[PDB]
Amino acid sequence: AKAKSRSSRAGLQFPVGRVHRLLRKGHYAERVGAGAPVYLAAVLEYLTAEILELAGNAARDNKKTRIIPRHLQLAIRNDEELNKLLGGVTIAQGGVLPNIQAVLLPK
Template sequence: MNHVGHIHRHLKSRTTSHRRVGTTAAVYSTAILKYLTAEGLELAGNASKDLKVKYEELDSLIKGTIAGGGVIPHIHKSLIGKKGQQKTNGCLDSVLSQDS
């Protein structure tokens, strides 16, 4: 999206008298652009939902990239504690046992 540094550099290059451009101006401008982009995307999404628009190409792209690119749901057996076993912090237990 829009980064504050990019916006700051753009604001500095567009000033006619080459005066100082504060960083708060860049932060504020970036926040405004981000808000307007989010509002525009939300309105477009609502309109397409209301009109029941279907995009087969977009559906196939999303299925191929998002659904196929996740994390495999597997937790190694050694990481799962046994029932009734209390969780302990290994570092703290070793320090406490050395002090005794």
Template sequence: MEDNRQKCNISRSARAQLNFSVSRIERFLREGNFSQRLSPSAPVFLAGVLEYLTADVLRLSVKEAQASGRKRITPEHISWAVENDKHLRKIFKIDSKSSVAEPSKPDEN
């Protein structure tokens, strides 16, 4: 007997067990014209890397918020988390002397 069930479409994000959209990242890579050719596994890998970095930044931001006695993460907590981690500081190329959280003062001319 033939099986009349339809094949269930499973997204690439679900197959890779990722929360970030692999299809959206592939679209960004194609629209960005970074290369003429794109491996099918490149957007999956990039989605995994972005998800890992995001989770790491959020984990450190939660620690910063808790250390300052807060329950809600603010942009300053994210900034402090990135600045206080040497690996993230290197990835984002942040100078240890500068601060991302402080807004720049407008020039008075």
């Protein structure tokens, strides 16, 4: 009778029950089947880990140890997949990539 979380069952860190409630209360459908929130939580955790890996690598690549928005921007615009997904996002304090056009360099 000892309660144990559905996230622990699924091997997930993200909160399965909170996702399930957000679906049920979001007006997205009249019913929400029992497998939908586990799948969605796993998908979100994958994308989170994919971002944070690249952010940590950019931190080491700048000899910093604290991730900051510059590192997120570099983690996103230096991947041809993440950049296709995050097409409309503007990131505050993110700045830009270094990319001068070769036409304009000295002769």
